[model samples]
Target chain A: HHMTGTIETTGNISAEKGGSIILQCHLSSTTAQVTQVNWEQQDQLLAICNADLGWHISPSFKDRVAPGPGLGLTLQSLTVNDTGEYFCIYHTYPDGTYTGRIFLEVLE
Target chain B: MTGTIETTGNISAEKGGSIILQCHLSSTTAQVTQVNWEQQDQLLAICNADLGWHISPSFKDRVAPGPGLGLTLQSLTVNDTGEYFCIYHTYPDGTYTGRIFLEVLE
Candidate 1:
């Protein structure tokens, strides 16, 4: 059987200009620690931010994205470009992988 | 301010039951008209019932999530258990992601 995962939010995350938005994802301990976490923008494979290497960023989202200890990824300096749904994915240690989707709505 | 992420639903199972994972957007535009569902490394299917449900060969028959509005999955099995992500592209290239956990209880 494949290792499964679930997604939960701390309610709808709404942020104002110069404010902050945190998209949180919790995975079952049944899977191993994630080596790489990928965040995508719809059809395109937007960026790959790794946990193994001191939290690196993909060229597309380098200056715009950051993540702390857990599976939560944060983005700073709110802008219209950042509006949309963000998908947070984890590749498990042994063999399985999991992902959670986030819908981001930017307000004025 | 920035975009908001909203999630609400459960994946507990019952035999021969149908489920739905809904993704709604406050922002409306031409770009978001196209929505797609993907499972890890594979682009499972793209919404186009109006255009015709274009299912990838791997998920041609086994997977069926209705297109256009809410993404629906029917008659799910244990194999259907996994993290399902909803991708919507909006005008000016705005993108969104929403997920649902599918489970099968015996």
Candidate 2:
């Protein structure tokens, strides 16, 4: 593997109920070859930002989540149920895929 | 503000016109806790009983929040054609979901 760096994300975040937050992740490599970016919550898929295929967001999240800068995901109108650890999956060229994690807390 | 609507099924709209994407509780048990509308898994908008409504920024200019689960997409384009899901979440009850396939007439 010729990888030189790791994925970077904002630290643990806390937001008010019904408020919003931005969850971001970046492939911090010298190559930085990003083919696709996917956001997920545990086993549940949130959104997909693909290069070759296209983009998609799961039904439950579509309306509240938006595309952020550089593999970032913006979430609005948050609920207590939305509090959880989120994962960012990065698919790259030749280097395969890797994932990062985000811990989000939503206060009721 | 609140939700009401047309039937859920195949709906069509001509290009450059406006159309409303609605998800009726074709089936439900308790009062709605949250109303969400997703276009091809991509969330278009959400109206939570607590959070009110928040439309995806990408869709903000083109889409407007309607009462409940109904969403108005103005100045439609051919690319907007896709399958939509209206999911209503209730407490102590299961999720109530509906589907709408939109065909944009070129």
Candidate 3:
């Protein structure tokens, strides 16, 4: 639907074990105000950020991840299990939620 | 002590029935900035002091506004069974997020 999955991203990331990488998402594609951005790994909630509420690292990632630079994630440590698809869901007011897909690889 | 965001807790409904998902700040007196109801990690609806209420197209026909920032979902389907999050953004308290599981009866 037009209300969801309309955002863009700069994905296809590759990282080394114990290295760091930022899950990039283009958040300027719209004039609407972005209130929240949720990061999901393989359809599972990984992290969430609300403009007013800050960032919440889901129990799955715990201290492994943190919010980085507006709607982005700074994964300070990479592991083999981190290799998967990440979807950045942009929740914009009046425009609904737009999602962008990103894929990453952790070299063992 | 600062309180938390409260929901209707775990709710149950029969197929084709209606259920109201309530969201409110319990005992906390912070300024509410925004509130959004998310279903299965997807945005279902949003509300705040600025914008009254906006529902995703996927649920526009069936979802309505309940008390405060709560939401009313109608015509429950087995596929709708899942966890719904009521994330409230407030000042001082920051974020108070809670969830309610919707169990659709067979």
Candidate 4:
């Protein structure tokens, strides 16, 4: 059997400035073992996780970003600049990597 | 202290193949001082105003700049799967950031 999987996002998200929102990622795998999880806003690293390290949030993100159960991302104290696309990457063993994308709109 | 930076959408490549992450910026002035590329939170490469291009030894010959400062990774493998970001630091206009995600298939 061919080892394959897919990555998916919960959906597009919208939030108000100063509020909070969550971006979720789900993986359907048949043969790979997950090794790492990375979350990015556009290309900037927001947060990353691995078995060796529970979670590491970038300094630029600091206390504004948090990891939810599984591959979820929580952003707090949202601002206008927070409105953009977000990507979640999962690195697996023996198979390869998968990514999911979602767009977030912060309202004024 | 104002500018805009945008990165390409998600990209994918077969293991051992090549891929490029595109980042573009528009500043108020032509100062176009420098460009910084990072993986996760680690610096990967830089196009300095005076020093030219400098890539981290960790990336070495496997990476280089594409047209207009885009990043190209060669001989990709499973370990190369991650999030990438590009920052354009310009004079008077401060900085702009762009991001992209790379997926490698076996």
Candidate 5:
């Protein structure tokens, strides 16, 4: 059975400069193993991790980015520029691919 | 000054099939914060305190999106055909707006 993924978040999360926020995306695919995961900001595609499984954290976001348990992305100490839509996409062999969207609201 | 808005994506569906809409915003200002999705001249969806999905009474539950994030349409009747859009406030003094041209399979 191919594992299906589910995206869950606080829906409306508020954060201030230097504050921390976590966006959750859950996966329920036992047969669908994730080989790579990426976090993209608009047209700039940033690779967090690949072939290493686990949680991949991008260097540009190293200080503020962390891997979440199961399936999720965490950004700590958010700044004003962090306000935008964030997407979590994964590559699962054979079973195709999946992605989810989350809008980050950064407050002054 | 308002910010820039752009939309780039292709939606494909067989004739009489349903389709979905995807949107993203790039902002220069960090003050204004709100996202809204409109169809035709009416407000269909909005995201602020929480994600609010308000489709035309005709759409109802038939309209949904991938993973429950984007906009999805079910059954896909012919009248459902039209331009779907995504609008947002960039705060301070800017806004990010874009639209998706949905072409029903003929």
Candidate 6:
């Protein structure tokens, strides 16, 4: 199925310093078959999941971050510096790359 | 169709410090209608031409609107390492997106 759509985020999220938070990402197209999902901070690859290759978590986030339900991301032991933007990119056949973003603010 | 939105450069911040992420919208018009900032894929702030600037509840007291389409984060920490994006909604030009990466060091 050929389709064109924009990535949508679930608003904004906040977490207490030294706490944890989860960011969600969803695709606008339901009919497209997802081939891979990439979780990145800016351009760096934090985690990646492929339908055939399983999951790979970056060393920097290997201990503190994990893939949650669907393409969501779970970040633990949050710090004040953890406040920033994250991008979730889904790669599907025909539709190509679709990305959604979430911002996490660590409260004092 | 003949414009671009992009980050000024990559940025780095030390733990317990502060940093600014710069974004620029290049077009023929000087007046921008709206500027939205996002982290990961979530909305963090919106600068409306008519309504001024509004920071998301989660980012209140922590983030501030900076020059141009930039954003300033106070008291940086390790968890703040990530990417930040700026979306500029301009008149007669639709919308454009720009992004910058943030690295937090110990």
User: Residue-wise lDDT of candidate 6 within B3-100, one digit each (tens)?
Assistant: 86534234555676555555555545745799888887988889898998899999887776654345667667888888888888877878888876
Docking class of 4: incorrect
After TM-score superposition, what is the CA distance of residue B100 in candidate 3 from its true location, in Å? 0.4
Docking quality category of candidate 2 according to DockQ thresholds: incorrect
DockQ per candidate, 2 decimals: 0.02, 0.02, 0.02, 0.02, 0.02, 0.02
Candidate 3: stretches off by over 4 Å: A1-108
Q: Write the per-residue lDDT of candidate 3 for residues A5-105, one digit (tens) a residue.
A: 23433335555688766454654435788888889999899898888989899987888886654466667677898888889888887787777776776
Which model, 1 or 2, shows the larger lDDT? 2
lDDT of 1 at A21: 47
Q: Which of 4 and 6 is the better model by TM-score?
A: 4
- Fnat of the models, one by one? 0.00, 0.00, 0.00, 0.00, 0.00, 0.00
What lDDT is reached at residue B13 by model 5?
42
Q: What would the per-residue lDDT of candidate 5 be over residues B9-39, giving only the tens digit for each residue?
A: 3233445544445443333555535666677
TM-score of 2: 0.47
Compared to the true structure, candidate 3 yields what TM-score?
Answer: 0.48
Name every residue pair that clashes in candidate 3. Answer: none
Those runs of model 6 whose alpha carbons end farther than 4 Å from true positions after fitting are A1-108
Lowest-sum lDDT 10-residue window in model 5 chain A: A5-14
i-RMS, every candidate?
A: 12.3, 17.7, 18.5, 13.2, 12.9, 13.2
Candidate 4 regions with alpha-carbon error over 4 angstroms: A1-3, B1-106
Relative to the true structure, candidate 6 reaches a TM of 0.47
TM-score of each model, in listed order:
0.43, 0.47, 0.48, 0.48, 0.47, 0.47
Model 3, span B1-106: residue lDDT tens: 4875544444456688666566556677888888899987999899986888988999999876653466767778998888899888888888888877777777
Clashes of each: 19, 5, 0, 3, 3, 20
